[PDB]
Amino acid sequence: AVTLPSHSTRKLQTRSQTWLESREYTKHLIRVENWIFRNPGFALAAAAIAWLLGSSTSQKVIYLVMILLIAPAYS
């Protein structure tokens, strides 16, 4: 189906390389770079929520990160 689980939840921490180790570093990082390049307007719609949700400016940066991580993956 569409909802296959990732095996990176339980990667076997051994000495050798896993199945896709080389494609594991830039896997979600491409996926958020590709989403926000195609959808630039939500970066100022996440910032408008992040500046409005948190109290201190060191929590508003955290929501500006965390809204821009949920939305390219849709949870």
């Binding site: 569409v2 390389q17 180790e21 195609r38 307007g41 719609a45 939305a71 849709y74």
Partner: protein, 501 residues
């Protein structure tokens, strides 16, 4: 008729002095247009054949590694090289391996290993380009009059039917005129370029299955592609997205191609409508036109027809057609010829007064035979009422009860224009518009906000609109400020866009 059983049938009336009404012909929906003294025409968009699609990059989803080889190189004795690394058909990766006296070398250290593997793609998906100057919207028409129930779905013969006509809308000649004999000519003034944004959509093709893939999505797929203008052995740019090179530990580097990505991309479409193909033309099952209906030349057939004598007989029991309307098929018994059916709705049967409007304006028997079946449609009021389809004592009077209410119809049409405004958005303000200082101001205030929503959020799935809609709910029940509207304006605008699906 052709629309009378559809759950998505719309009723369009109220015009610019009888000249024209502007309508948005949705592709799964149906439009019933009725005027002051003009025949009720049922208008439906049925296909959108996209001709002259020239292909763009065509990705690979199932590859195959042919005869592979590998060459190693001693530490600080150069770099490794295969003579078939100068071949574009082989996918290649350079890596460092443990090289030592056990591995034939004479100097211990990290060597260099080059692994080449011949890329051969067995199955590929192909994205063709859609140009908006090549669309052919077919508009099927079917007027209300001398037709029976075996002409609703029946399309077998409409060039001589005089009640039905196709209208093919190309952007070369978008305006068109359908000759309906006696009924005049329904003039259409369609807008085929501003339909379903076809300059930002492609036409995928995968194991003889086709989709309307978006332009931005198709240029983001990480698969080996040749350019589409490559008509030999394909070059396959980006071969490295299906093979995987792994070094074990030592002077050993394995290469394994990833599997058939056909099922990995069917689960990666989801939001793309799929289309068929009757040749090189890709017939669609979705979209919408934007059609202005010039009804100056469309006249009523048989105003001069004399009434019927007697002996109307039901062929079928009348049924309520999902919207409150009542479709009645009668059978005239007699040879009056081109005569006119005396039918109405009659609360207080003895006074015999009209109480509700008739959908089929001017119901007409046309054939001069003794028994010619014929079909009406009626719109009863909310309550007990009677369907009188005759004159004299041989009239047929059928007691009808319409289950519903006036505020139930007003709530049924509120959701109906809210589903249409979620599907279309800007275009749903011109579905029955006659040209106004408010319906073109309400559209202009919506086209501004619609562009500041399709660019602002605009790329959210079904689940996240319900997720950043709930977040703005908590910013709409809190953060007491002047921007409490702006966090509740993007509550309904995001949550109702997200459900009415």
């Amino acid at each position: 008729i052709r629309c009378i059983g559809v759950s998505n049938r719309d009723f369009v009336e109220g015009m610019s002095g009888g000249t024209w009404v502007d309508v948005v012909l949705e592709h799964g929906g149906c439009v019933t247009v009725m005027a002051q003294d003009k025949p009720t025409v049922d208008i439906e968009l049925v296909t959108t054949t996209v001709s002259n699609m020239a292909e763009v990059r065509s990705y690979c989803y199932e590859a195959s590694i042919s005869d592979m080889a590998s060459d190693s190189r001693c530490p600080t004795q150069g770099e490794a090289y295969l003579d078939k690394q100068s071949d574009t058909q082989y996918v290649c990766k350079r890596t460092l391996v443990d090289r030592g006296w056990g591995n034939g070398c004479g100097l211990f250290g990290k060597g260099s290993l080059v692994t080449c593997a011949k890329f051969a793609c067995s199955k590929k998906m192909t994205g063709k380009s859609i140009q908006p100057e090549n669309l052919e919207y077919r508009i099927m028409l079917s007027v209300h009059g001398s037709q029976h129930s075996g002409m609703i779905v029946n399309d077998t013969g409409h060039e001589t039917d005089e009640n039905r006509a196709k209208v093919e809308i190309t952007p070369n000649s978008p305006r068109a005129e359908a000759t309906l004999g006696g009924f005049g000519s329904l003039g259409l003034d369609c807008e085929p370029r501003t339909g379903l944004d076809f300059s930002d959509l492609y036409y995928l093709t995968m194991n003889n299955k086709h989709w309307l893939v978006h332009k931005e999505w198709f240029h983001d797929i990480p698969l080996p592609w040749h350019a589409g203008a490559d008509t030999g052995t394909p070059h396959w740019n980006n071969k490295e997205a299906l093979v995987e090179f792994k070094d074990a530990h030592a002077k050993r580097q394995t290469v394994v191609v990833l599997g058939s990505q056909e099922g990995a991309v069917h689960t990666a479409l989801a939001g793309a409508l799929e289309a068929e193909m009757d040749g090189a033309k890709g017939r669609l099952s979705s979209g919408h036109l934007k059609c202005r209906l010039k009804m100056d030349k469309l006249r009523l057939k048989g105003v001069s027809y004399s009434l019927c004598t007697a002996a109307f007989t039901f062929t079928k029991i009348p049924a309520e057609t999902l919207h409150g309307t009542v479709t009645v098929e009668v059978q005239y018994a007699g040879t009056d010829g081109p005569c006119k059916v005396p039918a109405q709705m009659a609360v207080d049967m003895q006074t015999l007064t009209p109480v509700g409007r008739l959908i089929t304006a001017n119901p007409v028997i046309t054939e001069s035979t003794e028994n010619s079946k014929m079909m009406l449609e009626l719109d009863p009021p909310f309550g007990d009422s009677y369907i009188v389809i005759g004159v004299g004592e041989k009239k047929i009077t059928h007691h009808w009860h319409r289950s519903g209410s006036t505020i139930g119809k007003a709530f049924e049409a509120t959701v109906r224009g809210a589903k249409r405004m979620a599907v279309l958005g800007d275009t749903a303000w011109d579905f029955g518009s006659v040209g106004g200082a408010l319906n073109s101001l309400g559209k202009g205030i919506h086209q501004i906000f619609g562009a500041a929503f399709k660019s602002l959020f605009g790329g959210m799935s079904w689940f996240s609109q319900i997720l950043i809609g709930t977040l703005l709910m908590w910013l709409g029940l809190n953060t007491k400020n002047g921007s409490i509207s702006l966090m509740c304006l993007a509550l309904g605008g995001v949550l109702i866009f997200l459900s009415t699906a």
